[PDB]
Design a protein around this nucleic acid. Structure first.
Ligand code: MG
Ligand code: MG
Length: 87
RNA sequence: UCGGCGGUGGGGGAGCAUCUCCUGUAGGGGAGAUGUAACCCCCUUUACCUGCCGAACCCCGCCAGGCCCGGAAGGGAGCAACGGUAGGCAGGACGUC
C-alpha cells in the first residue's frame, strides 16, 4: 500500500489529494513521522524519498510503502491520531 | 427628425469549488451538502443579433509537448495555444423616455 503525504496534508484540499478530514490532518507532514507511526502499529514501512505525487508532480514529497491488508482510509485516520498524539 | 436611457427573470441537468463520506494494497473509482455566471435544455408572455477588444498577473472549461504514478496498459495535475464568461467599444429591426 502507498501512503502519499498529501493524503494527510492539512494545507491541501481534498481535490489536491487530502483524504483525511481537517481536524486530523497534519500540516506539512513528515515521512519520518509517518514511518514512526506505522511501526508503532506493527507494520514494516519503507520510505521512498524519490517519488512524486502526480497531483503535485513538481513537488519531490516522497512516499511510504507498507504491506497492509486492512482498510486504507482507516489506517490513515489512525496514523494521524498517533502523530497528533505523541506526548 | 435629432438626442437620451435599458439590457430580463425562473426551474432543471451538467461540470467545476470547498467540505464530509464510502472504496481501490500506485494513478484511481464513486456518494452527499453547500456554492456557482461560464456548458446544455425548457418556461413565458419584449431584451436579441454583430464584428472587434477582454480578464498580464488564478474568471471558468479545456489542454499539444513536457512533468508525474506505472513493466506496460492505463491514469493524474497542468504551462502555452484554443473555447468561453464577467466586463469595455462601435454599430443593427426590438423595449422604454
Ligand atoms: Mg500528453
Ligand atoms: Mg515506469
Amino acid at each position: 500500500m502507498i501512503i502519499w503525504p498529501s493524503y494527510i496534508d492539512k494545507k491541501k484540499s481534498r481535490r489536491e489529494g487530502r483524504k483525511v478530514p481537517e481536524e486530523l490532518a497534519i500540516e506539512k507532514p513528515s515521512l519520518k513521522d509517518i514511518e514512526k507511526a506505522l511501526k508503532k502499529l506493527g507494520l514494516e514501512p519503507k520510505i521512498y524519498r524519490d517519488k512524486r505525487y502526480p497531483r503535485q508532480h513538481w513537488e519531490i514529497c516522497g512516499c511510504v510503502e507498507v504491506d497492509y491488508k486492512g482498510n486504507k482510509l482507516q489506517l490513515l485516520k489512525e496514523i494521524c491520531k498517533i502523530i497528533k498524539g505523541k506526548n
